[PDB]
């Protein structure tokens, strides 16, 4: 188990660690988070008590280094940093645990939620979508736009998501205009899977990354990406059977985890009704359709 210590908590802030969150009061004696499960990527995110504008946070993998959080009073945010002096880090961590100034990552032993939301997400692949290669962790916030959003403005602060556009030359083969637009299997399987991602794990990882950034940061372009990658599968008549079964599980745990009161802005009515009721795959997402219908039957 790993630790992300905090230098201090000078400003009142709601702190998230994966799907958990807790309030820290201005200058409350808080020195970070302990018992973080190794083996998964994680996100530690922030929403200031005084300006709920800008949720922001860091994707990180404790196997890639020793990371800590330190408030920057100039830039006005909690910043993730890497400690290269490993003994200095061990020394610091140990003191804070002994004085019990850390909250424990509070995983129920029955609870595979975080795994099921991040099964295909990889910090090294996270660095491909959020470009800032001098850090091993990745910063994301509410306002960051995507490369596609920027075609339609700072490219350094962008989410470089794979471009999906159903009315694009990439999506449509000359001579199969109707066929390729009404059945997107060519775009999914040849252009995207074989051509860009290489395999479905990679397809799933981007789809998972898009969802989590939409949920934790209310990042709109991420929500667009997540919906686009779903709709591309649902609108393809020819999808490998294991991908459909895996998609149903992915979406099931995503819908399960979503806040009940955020469903009105994170879930696209058109895409979901189309995916569950009209698309080629309308019969293939049994778990997802069952959780959607029992939790958000308003949307449908």
């Amino acid at each position: 188990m790993n630790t992300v210590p905090f230098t201090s908590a000078p400003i009142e802030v709601t702190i998230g660690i994966d799907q958990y969150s807790f309030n820290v009061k201005e200058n409350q004696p808080f020195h970070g988070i302990k018992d973080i499960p190794i083996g998964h990527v994680h996100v530690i995110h922030f929403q200031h008590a005084d300006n709920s504008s800008m949720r922001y946070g860091y994707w990180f993998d404790c196997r890639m280094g020793n990371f800590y959080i330190q408030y920057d009073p100039k830039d006005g945010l909690y910043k993730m940093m890497e400690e290269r002096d490993g003994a200095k880090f061990e020394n610091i961590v140990h003191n804070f645990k002994e004085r019990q100034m850390m909250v424990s990552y509070p995983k129920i032993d029955e609870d595979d939620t975080w795994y099921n939301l991040t099964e295909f997400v990889q910090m090294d692949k996270i660095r491909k979508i959020v470009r800032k290669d001098e850090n091993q962790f990745s910063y994301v916030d509410s306002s960051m736009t995507t490369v596609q959003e920027n075609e339609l403005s700072d490219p350094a602060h962008s989410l470089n998501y794979t471009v999906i556009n159903f009315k694009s030359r990439e999506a449509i083969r000359p001579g199969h205009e109707m066929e390729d637009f009404l059945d997107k299997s060519y775009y999914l399987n040849t252009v995207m899977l074989q051509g860009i991602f290489k395999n479905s794990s990679n397809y799933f990882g981007e789809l998972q990354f898009a969802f989590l950034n939409a949920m934790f940061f209310g990042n709109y372009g991420s929500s667009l990406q997540w919906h686009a990658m779903i709709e591309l599968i649902c609108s393809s008549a020819t999808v490998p059977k294991h991908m459909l079964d895996k998609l149903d599980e992915i979406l099931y745990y995503q819908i399960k985890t979503l806040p009940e009161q955020y469903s009105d802005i994170l879930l696209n009515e058109r895409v979901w009704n189309i995916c569950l009721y009209s698309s080629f795959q309308k019969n293939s997402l049994h778990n997802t359709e069952k959780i959607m219908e029992n939790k958000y039957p308003e949307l449908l």
Partner: protein
């Protein structure tokens, strides 16, 4: 975006545009089978592609053989329309291509946009106008060439005959839409009006009779009466 009353004069400026109407592309007669089931028999149709400024109607005739062995023909028809319009644009020199294509039915937007991805600079637009282009098959000479066709074919017609020598394209378009609206509302009455006077002929090469300016006023007024008429007869007013 969409074309409507507010931006009506745009149709007569000097940017080359075309209207596309697909309402006569897929046409069927519905009949009873021997077993007493119902079946359709397709008949030839056409795509109505009209430059409103010049009057040119690039009438692409859709021969029934294009439907052979195809499923979902009402959906195929919008894509076939799009494919033929795309082919037409591609056949044309760059300086003669549409800067805009206006589709009379919103269902044509995605088919056409997809077939015209090679032409990002051509605006594909809808319209809020209720245009009467579906009545184009009530023009005898257009109906004849479609029904006579034995293979795919494109025939260009000037739908304004020689009117533009005497009136503007705005006025010629308004005449055309009133004629078509009349023909759509009561085809028998409309045709009676157009032909009641055997001394006014349709010169072989034209679509409409050779009315003088004053005869057109009369004709245009009678077409208005008809459209008011059938409106009452329809709603009892």
């Amino acid at each position: 975006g969409a074309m409507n009353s507010s931006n009506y004069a745009e149709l007569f400026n000097n940017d080359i545009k075309l209207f596309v109407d697909d309402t006569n592309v897929y046409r069927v007669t519905v009949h009873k089978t021997f077993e007493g089931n119902v079946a359709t028999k397709a008949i030839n149709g056409c795509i109505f592609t009209l430059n409103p400024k010049t009057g040119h109607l690039f009438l692409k005739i859709i021969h029934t053989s294009v439907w052979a062995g195809q499923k979902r023909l009402s959906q195929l028809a919008k894509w076939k329309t799009a494919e033929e319009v795309s082919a037409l644009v591609r056949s044309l020199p760059k300086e003669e291509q549409p800067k805009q294509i206006i589709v009379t039915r919103k269902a044509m937007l995605d088919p056409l946009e997809v077939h015209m991805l090679d032409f990002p600079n051509i605006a594909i637009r809808p319209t809020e106008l209720r245009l009467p282009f579906s009545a184009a098959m009530s023009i005898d000479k257009l109906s004849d060439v479609v029904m006579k066709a034995t293979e795919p074919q494109m025939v260009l017609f000037n739908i304004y005959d020689d009117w533009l020598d005497r009136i503007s394209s705005y006025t010629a378009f308004s005449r055309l839409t009133l004629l078509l609206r009349a023909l759509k509302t009561n085809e028998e009455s409309a045709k009676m009006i157009l032909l009641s006077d055997p001394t006014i002929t349709i010169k072989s090469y034209h679509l409409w009779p050779s009315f003088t300016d004053e005869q057109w006023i009369t004709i245009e007024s009678q077409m208005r009466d008809l459209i008011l008429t059938e409106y009452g007869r329809k709603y009892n007013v």
